[PDB]
């Protein structure tokens, strides 16, 4: 049920809840927490990042 996504831009974390991302990173989303933020994981670490900074990826064959 986790949704794959790829970062379209760098995202700098400014709070201890946020997950930093580098453009091109593949991340996995658990849920949407509010209008602007997803909660997800990168390399097993959980945090939040912006909806608009990622693209949702299609399923693998």
């Amino acid at each position: 049920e986790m949704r794959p996504a790829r970062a379209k831009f760098d995202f700098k974390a400014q709070t201890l809840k946020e997950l930093p991302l580098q453009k091109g990173d593949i991340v996995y989303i658990y849920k949407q927490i509010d209008q602007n933020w997803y909660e997800g994981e990168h390399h097993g670490r959980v945090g939040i990042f912006p909806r608009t900074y990622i693209e949702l990826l299609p399923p693998a064959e």
Partner: peptide
């Protein structure tokens, strides 16, 4: 270059 940054959740 990146999209407008959203504020942290309420």
């Amino acid at each position: 270059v990146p999209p407008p940054r959203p504020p942290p959740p309420e």
